[PDB]
From Swiss-Prot, chain D:
The chain holds residues 44 to 127 of 131 of the full protein. The chain crosses the membrane at residues 6-26, 52-77. It is found in: Plastid, Chloroplast thylakoid membrane. It is a multi-pass membrane protein. This is Photosystem I reaction center subunit psaK, chloroplastic. Its main location: plastid. It comes from Hordeum vulgare.
Length: 742, 222, 42, 84
């Protein structure tokens, strides 16, 4: 069956190699005859599958690499907790979080950057932050710098431990194949073990530490004399004072009359007006139910005993009439090629990151989070960016799998075979859908702008003119606002407040959430999003499906994954490798994310965020001009892009001045990218040649023969600089604007 | 081999090498396809021996003081449950002939000396009887197997007279008493975590009143 | 040992330490001569 | 509080689950059910004292499932008092 088989001490911890670069690649280890060697060295370091031919060694290598990654993550967490401990105003922030700006970074007074340590309130000076740690540290009842300090220490310990574990598992006790390739027990554990018990232990930490101290702070007390956590579990009488049921030990649970615990485990829903956040009772019930669900899920597959399924015994049964034999053998494909798994997991992880970004703003989990505007905004846009990048990586590695490790002779399948057998139909129909959406979602904006600039407003696309109504969205919102009436009696309000029914939650003269109406502008922006997503999918899916062989080049696969072209023959064959398909799709994903985040910023600052008067009149941060100025590109310039770019541009000579400076460098690089994206190579090669002559004239010609970057590396550096410029520009814009006005 | 809840991965390596193999291992840990460091069957027998011995000593000692206090002449100055002796600060403490912490690190250093030397012997058997040790050198060679050291330092009276059968009896006795002491220790500690009054007083209770049956209450308290 | 010496003589780490030392020198000069615009020695 | 709703429900569910196992009415350790029928018993190699080959896994899995089905059929207690 399945056992603990491993091997002993393959590679010794000897520095013999560190002084010899490129030991892994036979060609690289010979020596740098030119300068392209030092590019090619970094370029293929992590390329494990091109260093061997057996999956055992590359599996060991990736097992060690995961430990390296985890060590870096732990070190980052430790740095964060430290800087919170020794360099923040966290205690003053806890004193009253309504109007005290979270700052967690000071700068040394050397070169005039003292102005960076701007006024943040609470007798502190420091660069304001928007990471949003403080809402978490108030949720977990840290409420003391000693806790941050010791947590940073423990994080450092875990980091060193993981680094050790890595070194040991690669060098000394290397796992074997029948361990890795055994996915049944891995699924079994990770379902039951990691996620379930994780959520369970967190529910523990919440019901036994957070809930009481948070309730006390909501009652209003200086956290100095707030009783320490362990003094809430050792002596029961405190929790007894809080929750009568909680003073009944464990009888009401075991004896199946769970309703007694109804006080601290409940299903209220909505938000908590004391902090706008979620009712921690609800989130505790959530984490606990999720723990139980993962535990009961974990027991699916047979591992050693006689019960349970087998991932081979599940696929082959499914075989429909149209497709034929079904998923037979697919189990072998997804167990014999790492790149396949990397692609699948990257896709699912990007999608989950996006849905996390979405669910965050509309249901603020933490307390006093939906009122620190910049934090909410920055979190949402960061998660969106991460999701986009993960998705593109998924597509790229899927293409790499399609090229290298796919083969019908032994890694056969009858499903993917059919899929590839009609690729042309797929790409054609997706292309036509892309054209259709492009037309009927952007030409609408063009028509609206034109009919505006021609003095014919009553022929526009808006509520006051020829009208388009997003009826399905309002239908769903009505349903979600009337569902807690009959369908979900156990709830108290709608699942969130953004559903089109209820009241508004406002703390400290500022609003946090309220109903959200949808106008024709929302219809148009949603169709823009749909179109751009469809085009990115078109690019990447075409790349994957045509990575093997196209009707232009018959044997593309033999030429490898990443090569620049196939010469200028047959009318020119530039950018045919799947690698170049990903190079293209990157820009379109960037554009999709950019327009999405702009739409989000405008919609929030024009319909939700803002301040509330003493009487109750709302005056939003931007005045609520969305439904009347999002329908013209010229509007986007005037109402949003130009106007709300003030705070970044007057930012010189103030605390926010750093956000100003980047706003130029971001643009600059942004420029710079074109120089690599537009030019070619031969020109630069000849220029380098003349420069080498000019040097050689002075007996300075270096033996590391200069060489203009190879084509693929040129495109890579170009796209990297371009993404950097764009993202840094929107980053500076967002931070400066929101943290200045809000 | 009195089979109590065995399996086949047990019998893959539990072929009767440990003194008195009963055949009880559903999981099948030490399967010898790849010998896991510290999962070696030799190491497993070593571990059961060492653990059971420590548990015997602990079950005697933790219970000794208060128990003796009952109708004995060890003063009530130490009439305290083992889990209230001071090892569990949320229970009790005591003023000793030093402070708590330095005492702990000192005893840790001593036990570390002993067990480090024992482990070094484990790796290289007999190899302690070479280096200068201010005497004691001509004793620590052991009886070959680190499992069973022997030696007049650890064989004073003299048993297993001319025999391996007598050693087999004495030794079965060892495994049985180790497992029994393990059970008794674990039970005392669980009562302590759930009852809260102390083992010997629990006997004081369960001598007369049968109705106790505190699994019925399942009351979880400090 | 000599292997780690030849590794340390590889341009990345040497360059990082050299640049760190140079930057430290410059920032220390700036500390000991704030804003240092002209050459007020001759 | 013994013999009441909770007691009787839990005991009857778990005992009927164990009987379905031991008599051939459950797809336990040495029985894997197909799309339809169940009687496809095949061995795992887990010989135990039970005369029908019941290891210390199926006699635990059937118990877990019986307790789950019991808790589920009882905590729909909308007709015997929402509080006991
Ligand atoms: C998350 C960061 C990260 C991690 C975990 C790794 C992990 C690894 N890299 Mg690596 N690498 C990275 C980023 C990373 N890389 C980046 C950004 C570059 C620049 C492009 C490189 C360039 C690089 C080269 C050129 C080589 C590696 C190599 C390796 C492997 C052995 C390195 C080792 O044991 O050093 C251990 C170091 C310490 C314990 C401390 C040193 C300080 C290992 C899989 C080597 C390899 O796989 O060769 C087959 C190798 O030759 N890396
Ligand atoms: C993600 C990791 C990370 C990053 C980017 C920084 C970044 C910085 N640290 Mg830092 N630091 C970290 C982790 C990190 N630290 C950890 C884990 C510790 C604990 C050992 C420290 C302890 C530390 C001290 C004690 C100091 C810095 C200082 C600094 C700044 C110079 C710079 C902003 C300095 C600073 O900002 O002073 C105000 C400074 O004096 N760091
Ligand atoms: C956890 C996810 C993950 C993992 C394990 C890998 C791992 C790998 N990728 Mg990959 N990739 C990912 C995410 C990931 N990537 C994502 C999200 C994208 C989309 C942006 C890509 C896009 C991508 C491309 C387009 C290519 C790879 C390649 C590779 C392989 C060689 C790595 C290399 O040359 O970089 C070495 C390290 C560097 C070059 C450092 C670059 C640092 C950046 C550019 C600076 C800017 C950062 C601020 C390696 C197996 C290459 C490959 O297989 O070559 C044959 C390849 O062509 N990947
Ligand atoms: C530290 C705890 C510990 C460890 C490591 C082992 C280790 C082992 N036991 Mg074990 N065992 C223990 C406590 C322990 N036992 C206790 C407390 C009992 C009493 C219930 C038993 C009863 C027991 C039986 C009945 C059997 C084992 C067996 C084995 C085997 C392996 C060496 C098997 C054996 O005979 O060893 C080969 C076997 O059949 N154990
Ligand atoms: C592994 C065996 C073991 C361990 C770890 C302990 C541990 C302890 N015993 Mg103890 N004890 C044991 C076996 C053990 N006992 C046995 C078998 C007996 C019967 C003779 C006793 C009789 C006993 C008495 C009479 C007392 C302790 C006491 C103590 C505590 C202080 C230790 C001490 O006096 O310093 C050693 C002191 C030196 C000067 C050396 C400590 C919790 C003291 C205490 O506070 O009671 C709990 C105490 O007064 N023990
Ligand atoms: C009470 C039951 C019991 C019976 C034996 C029986 C034996 N022990 Mg022993 N021992 C026990 C408990 C027991 N042990 C405990 C709780 C610790 C030890 C520590 C121990 C050591 C340190 C040594 C023995 C040795 C011996 C042998 C003489 C004999 C086989 C000796 C031995 O292994 O001789 C070869 C020896 O040196 N025992
Ligand atoms: C080793 C044998 C042993 C013996 C003689 C007892 C004896 C007793 N136990 Mg006990 N128990 C044992 C093992 C043992 N237990 C083990 C291994 C556990 C862990 C599951 C427990 C857990 C336990 C609990 C949770 C409780 C007892 C209680 C009791 C008392 C009724 C009685 C004195 C009850 C009590 O409160 O005792 C005063 C009680 O509530 N036991
Ligand atoms: C056969 C008896 C029986 C009866 C009358 C009920 C009745 C009920 N169950 Mg229920 N349930 C049963 C068996 C039963 N269950 C079993 C066998 C299980 C699996 C072990 C469950 C698991 C279950 C869950 C997980 C949930 C219900 C819920 C409910 C309630 C709402 C169901 C709905 O759609 O509206 C309702 C009172 C829901 C509820 O909240 O109950 C109030 C709910 O979430 N049931
Ligand atoms: C609805 O699809 C349902 C239909 C059912 O196919 P089968 O029952 O043969 O497929 C069995 C599935 O388990 C897939 O293997 O899927 C197809 O026929 C493939 C072609 C989809 C055509 C989609 C056109 C757009
Ligand atoms: C006749 C006979 C016999 C038998 C007997 C019997 C019938 C017994 C029973 C037994 C049993 C009776 C067992 C049981 C088991 C059970 C279990 C093992 C359970 C578990 C449970 C759990 C674990 C739970 C869980 C949970 C929780 C905790 C919460 C949430 C929900 C749930 C439910 C999931 C013998 C063998 C003696 C011998 C021969 C003759």
């Amino acid at each position: 069956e399945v056992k603990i088989v491993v091997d002993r001490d393959p590679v010794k911890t000897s520095f013999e190699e560190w002084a010899r670069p490129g030991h892994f690649s036979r060609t690289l280890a010979k020596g740098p005859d030119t300068t392209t060697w030092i590019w090619n060295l970094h370029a293929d370091a992590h390329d494990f599958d091109s260093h061997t031919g057996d999956l055992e060694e590359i599996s060991r290598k990736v097992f060690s690499a995961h430990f390296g990654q985890l060590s870096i993550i732990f070190l980052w967490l430790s740095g964060m907790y430290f800087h919170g401990a020794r360099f923040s105003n966290y205690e003053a922030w806890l004193s009253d979080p309504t109007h005290i700006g979270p700052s967690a970074q000071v700068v040394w007074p050397i070169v005039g950057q003292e102005i960076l340590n701007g006024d943040v309130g609470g007798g502190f000076r420091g660069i304001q932050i928007t990471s949003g740690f403080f809402q978490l540290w108030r949720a977990s009842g840290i409420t003391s710098e000693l806790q941050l300090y010791c947590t940073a220490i423990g994080a450092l310990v875990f980091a060193a431990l993981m680094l050790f574990a890595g070194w040991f598992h690669y060098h000394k006790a290397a796992p074997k194949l029948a361990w890795f390739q055994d996915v049944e027990s891995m699924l079994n554990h990770h379902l039951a073990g990691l996620l379930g018990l994780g959520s369970l232990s967190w529910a523990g930490h919440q019901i036994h530490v957070s809930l009481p101290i948070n309730q006390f702070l909501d009652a209003g007390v200086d956290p100095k004399e707030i009783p320490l956590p362990h003094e809430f579990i050792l002596n029961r009488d405190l929790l007894a004072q809080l929750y009568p049921s909680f003073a009944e030990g464990a009888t009401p649970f075991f004896t199946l009359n769970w309703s007694k615990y109804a006080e601290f485990l409940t299903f209220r829903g909505g938000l908590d007006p004391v902090t706008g956040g979620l009712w921690l009772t609800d989130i505790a019930h959530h984490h606990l139910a999720i723990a139980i669900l993962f535990l009961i899920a974990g027991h699916m597959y047979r591992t050693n005993w006689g019960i349970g399924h087998g991932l081979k015994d599940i696929l082959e049964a499914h075989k429909g009439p149209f497709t034929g034999q079904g998923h037979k053998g697919l189990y072998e494909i997804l167990t014999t090629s790492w790149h396949a798994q990397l692609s699948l997991n990257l896709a699912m992880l990007g999608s989950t990151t996006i849905v996390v970004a979405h669910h965050m703003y509309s249901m603020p989990p933490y307390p006093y989070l939906a009122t620190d505007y910049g934090t909410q905004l920055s979190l949402f846009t960061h998660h969106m960016w991460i999701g986009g990048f993960l998705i593109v990586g998924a597509a790229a590695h899927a293409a790499i799998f399609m090229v290298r490790d796919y083969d019908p002779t032994t890694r056969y399948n009858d499903l993917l075979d059919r899929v590839l057998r009609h690729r042309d139909a797929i790409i054609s129909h997706l292309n036509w859908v892309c054209i259709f959406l492009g037309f009927h979602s952007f030409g609408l904006y063009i028509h609206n702008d034109t009919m505006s600039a021609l003095g014919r407003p009553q022929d526009m696309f808006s509520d006051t003119a020829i009208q388009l109504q997003p009826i399905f969205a309002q239908w769903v919102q009505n349903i979600h606002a009337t569902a807690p009436g009959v369908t979900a009696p156990g709830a108290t309000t709608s699942t969130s407040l953004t559903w089109g029914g209820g009241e508004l939650v406002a703390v400290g003269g500022k609003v946090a959430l309220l109903p959200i109406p949808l106008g024709t502008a929302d219809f148009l922006v949603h169709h823009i999003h749909a179109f751009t997503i469809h085009v990115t999918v078109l690019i990447l899916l075409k790349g994957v499906l045509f990575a093997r062989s196209s009707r232009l080049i018959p044997d593309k696969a033999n030429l490898g994954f990443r090569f620049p072209c196939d010469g200028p023959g047959r009318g020119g064959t530039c950018q045919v490798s799947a690698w170049d398909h990903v190079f293209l799709g990157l820009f379109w994903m960037y554009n999709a994310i950019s327009v999405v985040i702009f739409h989000f910023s405008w919609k929030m600052q024009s319909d939700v965020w803002g301040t509330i008067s003493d009487q109750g009149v709302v005056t939003h941060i931007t005045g609520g001009n969305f439904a009347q100025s999002s329908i013209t590109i010229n509007g986007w310039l005037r109402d949003f892009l130009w106007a709300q770019a003030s705070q970044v541009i007057q930012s010189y000579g103030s605390s926010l001045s750093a956000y100003g400076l980047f706003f130029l460098g971001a643009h600059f690089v942004w420029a710079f990218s074109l120089m690599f994206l537009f030019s070619g190579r031969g020109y630069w090669q000849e220029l380098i040649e003349s420069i080498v002559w000019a040097h050689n004239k002075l007996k300075v010609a270096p033996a590391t023969q200069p060489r203009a970057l190879s084509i693929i590396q040129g495109r890579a550096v170009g796209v990297t600089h371009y993404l950097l410029g764009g993202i840094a520009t929107t980053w500076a814009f967002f931070l400066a604007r929101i943290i200045a006005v809000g | 081999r009195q089979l109590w809840f065995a399996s086949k991965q047990s019998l893959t390596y539990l072929d009767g090498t440990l003194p008195g193999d009963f055949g009880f291992d559903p999981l099948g840990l030490s399967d010898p396809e790849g010998t896991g460091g510290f999962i070696e069957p030799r190491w497993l027998a070593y571990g059961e021996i060492f653990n059971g011995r420590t548990a015997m000593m602990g079950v005697v000692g933790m219970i000794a003081p208060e128990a003796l206090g009952k109708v004995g002449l060890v003063p009530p100055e130490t009439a305290i449950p083992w889990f209230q002796a001071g090892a569990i600060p949320p229970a009790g403490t005591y003023q000793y002939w030093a402070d708590p912490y330095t005492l702990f690190v000192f005893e840790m250093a001593l036990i570390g000396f002993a067990e480090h030397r024992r482990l070094q012997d484990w790796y290289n058997p007999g190899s302690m009887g070479k280096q200068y040790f201010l005497g004691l050198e001509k004793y620590l060679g052991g009886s070959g197997d680190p499992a069973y050291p022997g030696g007049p330092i650890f064989n004073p009276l003299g048993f297993g007279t001319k025999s391996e059968k007598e050693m087999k009896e004495l030794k079965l006795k060892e495994i049985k008493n180790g497992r029994l002491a393990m059970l008794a220790f674990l039970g005392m500690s669980l009562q302590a975590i759930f009852t809260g009054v102390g083992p010997f007083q629990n006997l004081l209770d369960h001598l007369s009143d049968p109705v106790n049956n505190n699994i019925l209450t399942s009351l979880k308290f400090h | 040992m000599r292997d780690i010496k030849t590794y340390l003589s590889v341009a990345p780490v040497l360059s990082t330490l050299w640049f760190g030392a140079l930057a430290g020198l410059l920032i220390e000069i700036n500390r000991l001569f704030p804003d240092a615009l002209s050459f007020p020695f001759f | 509080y013994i013999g009441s709703s909770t007691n009787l429900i839990m005991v009857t569910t778990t005992t009927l689950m164990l009987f379905a196992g031991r008599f051939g009415l459950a797809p336990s350790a040495n029985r894997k059910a197909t799309a339809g029928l169940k009687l496809e018993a095949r061995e795992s190699g887990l010989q135990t004292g039970d005369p029908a080959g019941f290891t210390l896994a199926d006699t635990l899995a059937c118990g877990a499932v019986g307790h789950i089905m019991g808790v589920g059929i009882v905590l729909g207690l909308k007709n015997t008092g929402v509080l006991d």
